[PDB]
Amino acid sequence: GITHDKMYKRSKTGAVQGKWHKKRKYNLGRQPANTKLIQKISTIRCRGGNIKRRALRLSHGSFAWGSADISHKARILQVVYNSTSNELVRTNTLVKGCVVQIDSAPFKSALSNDTLDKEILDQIRGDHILARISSRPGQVGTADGYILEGPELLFYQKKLAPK
Amino acid sequence: SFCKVNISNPVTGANKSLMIEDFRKSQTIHGLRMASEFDGAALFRITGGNDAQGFPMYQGVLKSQRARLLLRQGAKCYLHRRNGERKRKSIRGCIVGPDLHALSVVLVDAGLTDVVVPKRLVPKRASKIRRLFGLPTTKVDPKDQMLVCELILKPKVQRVVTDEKYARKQRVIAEKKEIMRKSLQQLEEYKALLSRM
Amino acid sequence: ARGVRKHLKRLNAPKHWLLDKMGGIWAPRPTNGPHGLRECIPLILILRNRLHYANTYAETSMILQDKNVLIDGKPRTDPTFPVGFMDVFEIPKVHKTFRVLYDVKGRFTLVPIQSNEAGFKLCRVQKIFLGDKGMPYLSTHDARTIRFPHPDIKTNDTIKINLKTGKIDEWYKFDIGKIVMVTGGRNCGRIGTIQAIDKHMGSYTMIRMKDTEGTEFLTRLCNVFVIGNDSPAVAIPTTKGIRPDIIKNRELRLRSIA
């Protein structure tokens, strides 16, 4: 079926290369999960056993505000930005590294301490916080992440500027 | 032939056979599916059948003709030779129509039901002989080696908690504790050693 | 292929087994266990081929079913069990106890040993590593594992193990001037003293040794086994790890038919 064997590529001088065997089982690939937002995780048997979890339709995650170290479990509300393609944002597909809006309720108990980023407290004062997925949902069936801060936060806030 | 109707009564345990024209016309039985009630005034619940050429009915195909299907190991109408082997086969002569040369039927809620067949085999599991005789399945004298069976090759009760088997299990537990105790002592020795060093 | 190899042609068997090229298409294939395929000997090749206690394969099996053979104190009922360097070989009904070492031609020999010696074993520390919940472990040349080792034991040292408890009672450090024996290569089997250790960043570390007659030789650090501290902790064959030259070997051969 799908293979990641290199026998089908040209050489580095552009030359066509011949075929000297048929497809081997250990060189197979599978189709991607295309994990949707808003709960199923399928099981995949792999080489030697070694179960892989493959998520479809995740809703929640566990998130960390690293600087003050406030970790809760929160609901992922919307995929807002993706580096690879804007098609992956329009569909709310969950992949590693995409920028999301998560629910502000679990972190409202963190509204009291000052000397805590006002670029995070003002986020909390509303309805959602900007965060980033840090796991591979197709390989482990899970979608967790961290809360953006620093120059990264500003870079993505200008990427989502109302312009 | 025309149609051999294998009736089978499980309330008593008997099996009987009949015949019928079952030709192309009205036949108030036609158009019914497997696991359906009919009123049996011409011969009750259908459970299977073979058509001409002896192809068996298959549940769910929802057709009155034959069909091919990729049957998988564990399913009916197929006996595999290797683990994981599948096979394409032909099935389902009708949802009962004129084609069938045989029908299989069971009787519900009762020529008339007369014979009562004995049960050849007797209960074997240890609990199977305590539900029969109303005995409790919770005591410290569960031995139950009554030997009657009415001399009816089959007994050798299973799942009996004897004395030696009780000792065996207790011994295994008493060693599964010794491992943990010695392991914790060794860990303590090593921690103290690094403390001295 | 599509999976592991279970056969071994006779011409493809290791050359120090001294198998003869007629009398068989096949050779025994050693089972996995304490020793690897190349640096071992199948147990059958000692009982039938060498000592003639058995004379065929089938009657070599029945000796090992009724458990007349102990390896390191345990009865092994498997004819292709891999026995190797430093394994204790004791047959009780004939009262024979041996230690398995190398001779000066890289072949396995059995050295008679006393009942006061067969209760311990020398192992080579192959690696130290952290296992489960961060605990330290050491691994040897026998596929043996020891948890919570004393912090002094480092890699390339040798340890001494009682053969009933399976615990450590002594260790020898790898140093300059230690007595050593080479376990493989082309100086396999001969015994000397370490006089150099040259490390090469990224690559193999070479060891220079010198025999008791003063002959010097070299090999890789993965082939030098410490047998004591200026005195071997065990018994060694009569030749004591001195290798003749081809001329002196020829004169000793001429003298046997003489």
Place this chain on the structure above:
RNA sequence: GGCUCAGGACAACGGUUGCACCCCCCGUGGCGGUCGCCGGACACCGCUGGCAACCCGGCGCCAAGACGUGCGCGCAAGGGCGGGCCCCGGGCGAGCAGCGUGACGCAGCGACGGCCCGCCCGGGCUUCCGGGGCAUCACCCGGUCGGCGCGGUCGCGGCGCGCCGAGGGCCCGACGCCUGGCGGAGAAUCAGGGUUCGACUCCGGAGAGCGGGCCUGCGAGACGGCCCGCACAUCCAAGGACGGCAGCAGGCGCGGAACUUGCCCAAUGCGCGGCGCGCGGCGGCGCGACGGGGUGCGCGCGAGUCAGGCGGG
């Protein structure tokens, strides 16, 4: 394990590296802490059937070292913080591996105690050098060369996809075409230097009429497993069912050219432990080829014949 050499020329293959990018049954050491004896049902089998034969149907009593659920001192995968701001032991040449701490999660092992860890053999890819002929084949390539991000995989990688740039190779022979092209260890010839061939014994690779696809398993893109298209055959009541000798013998065809449709697991080994095995062994045919001795000597032998040994399953 056995067979073959069709494909494939910066492949494969040979020596030489690496995985701090990996997976691994059995065996041999370890290790073993997990938020009162349960259930019902399947085959063999009984009673009845269908069918030309291939193959199956229905009802019913019955077990487990089979399942399923589980009694238990919390800990499987993945994730956020915990490094030093000339230059440099747990373990390295190399900041690697563990642990702590906040959040998720609830996996695996428990109804005869094993999840897990090291080794071992095996595999996957991978560094450097070697790796056919033709110039009446001089320019070639466009996922082609590099970058960024995700996916997929046992795993790295243009392996795939989106976006960005214009690279990459060449008379030290690229690209294209051809080969009655499997590679090595080796073999034939013979002062020294060379020439020619590498079907077949060992090692490695690839295939099972030709394309593809896949399940079960630690391991297969398996063909003495399954599914489909094509080209060919097989039985048949005409409804259907069904095949793969480049395994061992044997046959047809083709060619200048190549043997018995034998006996046996006694040996050498392999799977389960007592058997199995056309691996392999023993006979048969065999002027391909090798080695030894005769058709006399001055008077004793061999080739045959018949018996007993020895040998041999």
